[PDB]
Amino acid sequence: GLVPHMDAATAVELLDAQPQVWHHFLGYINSMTLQCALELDIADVIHRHGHPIPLNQLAAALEIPQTKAPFLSRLMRMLVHLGYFTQVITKPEVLPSYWLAPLSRLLLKQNPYNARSLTFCSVHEHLVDPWRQMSAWLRTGKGKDTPNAFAFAHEGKKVYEVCSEDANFSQLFSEGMAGDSWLFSRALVSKCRDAFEGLSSLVDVGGGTGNTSKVIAETFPNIHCTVFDLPGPKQTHPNLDYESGNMFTDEIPHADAVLFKWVLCDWPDEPVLKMLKQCKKALTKGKLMIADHVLDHESCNDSNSMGTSLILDMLFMSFLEGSLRTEKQWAKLFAEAGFKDYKITPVGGLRVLIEVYP
Amino acid sequence: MDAATAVELLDAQPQVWHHFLGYINSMTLQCALELDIADVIHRHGHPIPLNQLAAALEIPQTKAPFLSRLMRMLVHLGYFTQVITKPLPSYWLAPLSRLLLKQNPYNARSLTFCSVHEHLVDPWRQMSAWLRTGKEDGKDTPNAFAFAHEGKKVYEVCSEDANFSQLFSEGMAGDSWLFSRALVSKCRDAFEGLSSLVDVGGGTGNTSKVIAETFPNIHCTVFDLPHVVSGPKQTHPNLDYESGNMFTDEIPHADAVLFKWVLCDWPDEPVLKMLKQCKKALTKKGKLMIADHVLDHESCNDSNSMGTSLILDMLFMSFLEGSLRTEKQWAKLFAEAGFKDYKITPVGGLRVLIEVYP
């Protein structure tokens, strides 16, 4: 096309704003550099070394040729900035030596709460690729429509059907959820001890391999926990058992409390409401325990926290059928379901406990 | 693990989630551009209700709730505002959106599109493999991009894809429009006494046009590839274009040789060879002017700026053959090329002017 006033001050201001936009559109660079660090097992190799490891020895351990060591050095500098590792220079005039920073605890294979599997599935082609059809999906009205962009880009298949076809992919989700449950459950029983006092039974809906219920049963020895979920080895405890079922179409086991941990956020209001109504009928009195996001809660309303919450809302919009609800949205569902009262107790990790009374 | 430790780790987890979900920022911004949200709101001329916005975007009313959530994300990112009308959201523009508007010659649309293009994203899935590739077996390539493109560098891929190539060209031109205006203001003294300047890699002349107009004694010559300078470009009686390859062809003679955001694309060996040629030419005394990143300069030292610089360093590692050099790295090149002095003056947009004297 043919070649198309502004004072210097305006130009400089705009020039200085530009890197903010660059930072946004290059967001995937963070995803991919972290994924590399995991593929290369960097944190585990550094940890194994037992003390700071010089660049040349790190490259050798990672099977990176010395000719590529300068590129590894730059990758490490990025990862240091992200907060995973540290670097120092112990040789005078450059050879850096690398060690672990506290955030790397979440990367280590040896830790049952590591975020490796969740990272691999979150940056997987299956989850990233549908975004290239998001605008087209948003513009599709009611024959070629699908519940979400993911299905739009997967010949109409929801994530659950794709998981049934891709065992490796499926395994990443399962492992990622289990890892989060390991950590979240331990915070939950500490932060919300009062919510478990007086209970003799609890049903953990969508409880999978039982990481959440295991910790509940260990912490509160008088609570009989039942994991209720659809058909690796499950956690064992004398007060922990398992029942199979579909939470949407099958009757939920009876208990003093019904727990939904990071489950209701996956689904839209219509099936959630129907399910809550079933719970209300059943619990009449026990209570509903929802361990999930309250988007606008005071405990997670700082700018960084909100940023990550909204990123999750976008993620969920793309490949699930849910969202992060505000308190107002939660309260409306509870009222329409026939519940009378609720109480919110902060836990952490952008999430809270909601106790709901019928 | 005690409860305090579990809570601490749980509260650190969202930082990791935010890293691996970085691509969500890239994809939501790309959606905003594909849908032309900024331009549509701008044309509306005042804040626009959600339903009217959906219609203007050709999004069916049934999908308005999803648009609302996308807008909430984009408001958080800083592109739009939600204007409160009652104690149906209405949306307006925020200052950052100036960089998204098609009518602005400095908009970042083309740079966004090419940066998040599959050509640039996909090679990251082979970055670990490329880092582990040695020279021996003969499968090696200069970067991950070529590794993932059957050995082709970005320039060859551009030569094969005109639409893709145009994105890069437009992207660079947009930045030059803003950067040049800052440059001639913040570094006015650097242009004193010059009668000629060669703008090496000066593309369609946005930088040289501003120099030529601001400093009437300076005859400006843009030196770039033949195909780059055969089409529409900035014109001025004291501006002309010469074609050639800066590595293999003699750079035109001038009082100053300017490299604006060019040297960062290339590694030390060819850059040094070229700088030596410049030192010889400039003492046949002229000066070298490098408008580029000094990674550790105070003007880009803050955490946000450093984060963006390091992300650019990764981007450049993946699809170019360059890097963002520290002052130490620049000074070493200048010394080896035979230069005797330098001066660094900040400009903006993460970049500075380095004047280098023989």
TrEMBL record, chain A:
UniProt cross-references to InterPro entries, sorted A to Z: COMT-like, COMT_C, COMT_dimerisation, SAM-dependent_MTases_sf, WH-like_DNA-bd_sf, WH_DNA-bd_sf
Cross-referenced CDD domains: AdoMet_MTases
Full protein name: Coniferyl alcohol 9-O-methyltransferase
Domain of life: Eukaryota
Amino acids binding S-adenosyl-L-homocysteine: 181, 229, 246-247, 261
Entry's Gene Ontology molecular function annotations: O-methyltransferase activity; protein dimerization activity; S-adenosylmethionine-dependent methyltransferase activity
Residue intervals of the O-methyltransferase dimerisation domain: 22-109
Domain O-methyltransferase C-terminal: 131-340
Keywords for this protein: Methyltransferase, S-adenosyl-L-methionine, Transferase
Pfam families the UniProt entry points to: Dimerisation, Methyltransf_2
Gene Ontology BP, a term: isoflavonoid biosynthetic process
